[PDB]
Amino acid sequence: LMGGFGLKHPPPQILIKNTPVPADPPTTFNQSKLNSFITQYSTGQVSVEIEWELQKENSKRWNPEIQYTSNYYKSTSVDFAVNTEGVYSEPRPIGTRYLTRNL
Amino acid sequence: LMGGFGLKHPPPQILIKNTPVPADPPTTFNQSKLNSFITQYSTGQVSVEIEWELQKENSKRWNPEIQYTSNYYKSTSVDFAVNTEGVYSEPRPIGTRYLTRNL
Ligand code: NA
Ligand code: NA
């Protein structure tokens, strides 16, 4: 309902975790689980490549269609670009239904 | 200068003409060229097929481009369609420069 493709076997969940690294333990044995760990975090890159199949348009509509377009006249900033502060932003929601089709 | 492609050997001129058909001539010989012809005209269909090579766009521009689009809101008629009188019309001139390219 929120939109999209419903899949019985969707892309799998990808779980990740930093392995706990004990800080020095006591010198004489104790049953209790360790609760003192070295403070750490991780970082790295991640890549996702997806192949999409397109269904080309085959319309005999004579007149031009509606199309998503960038604004023409001057503006303080560029839509879908960064700030003077380096902040990226999406000015508006962009749908998918521009071309038309008969029923 | 009016725009377009300059060709040393452009598509050839295609000339057409209805052959003159004499109306009855005099019964005794006369030097003069005939000047009395049967009234006629011709009609038929004509076809032109042209193959065009396209140079696809290869831009890394992140933000959307400007695009020619049909108007969104209601209107008395449809742009680039016929009249209630069956008259076709081109509401505006449509150029060719929407996508962008670096220098
Ligand atoms: Na835009
Ligand atoms: Na239009």
- Residues making up chain A, counted from first to last: 103
Vertex A15: Cα angle to A45 and A47 (nearest 5): 25
Q: What 3-state DSSP class applies to A22?
A: strand
Q: How far, in whole angstroms, is CA A96 from its chain's centroid?
A: 17
Q: Please list every residue in chain B whose beta carbon sits closer than 8 Å to the beta carbon of residue A80.
A: 62-64
Structure tokens at B84: 């209630």
Annotated resolution, angstroms: 2.6
Dihedral class, residue A32 (left if φ above 0, else alpha if ψ from -120 to 50, else beta): beta
Q: Do B59 and B100 meet the contact criterion of CB atoms below 8 Å apart? A: yes
> How far is Cα A98 from Cα A69, in angstroms, rounded to an integer?
11
Integer angstrom CA distances of residue A57 from A60, A99, A100, B98:
10, 8, 9, 20
**For every residue of chain B, which 3-state class applies, written as one string?**
CCCCCCCCCCCCCCCCCCCCCECCCCCCCCCCCCCCECCCCCCCCCCCCCCCCCCCCCCCCCCCCCCCCCCCCCCCCCCCCECCCCCECCCCCCCCCCCCCCC
Task: Give the distance from residue B65's alpha carbon to the nearest chain A alpha carbon, in angstroms.
Answer: 5
Integer angstrom CA distances of residue A44 from A12, A21, A38, A48, B64:
20, 19, 20, 14, 30
Residue whose token pair is 């080309």: A56
- Ligand 1 center to residue B71 CA distance, Å? 17
- CA nearest to A67 within chain B: B69
Structure tokens at A46: 């991640």
Judged by CB atoms closer than 8 Å, whether chains meet at B64 and A81 is answered as no
- Ligand 1 center to residue B54 CA distance, Å? 25
Half-sphere exposure of A94 (CA within 13 A, CB side): 11
> How far is Cα B3 from Cα B52, in angstroms, rounded to an integer?
17
Of B53, B51, B60, B52, the closest CA to residue B99 belongs to B60
Judged by CB atoms closer than 8 Å, whether chains meet at B65 and A70 is answered as yes
Of A40, A49, A43, the closest CA to residue A21 belongs to A40
Judged by CB atoms closer than 8 Å, whether chains meet at A79 and B63 is answered as yes
Half-sphere exposure of A46 (CA within 13 A, CB side): 6
Way the structure was solved: X-ray
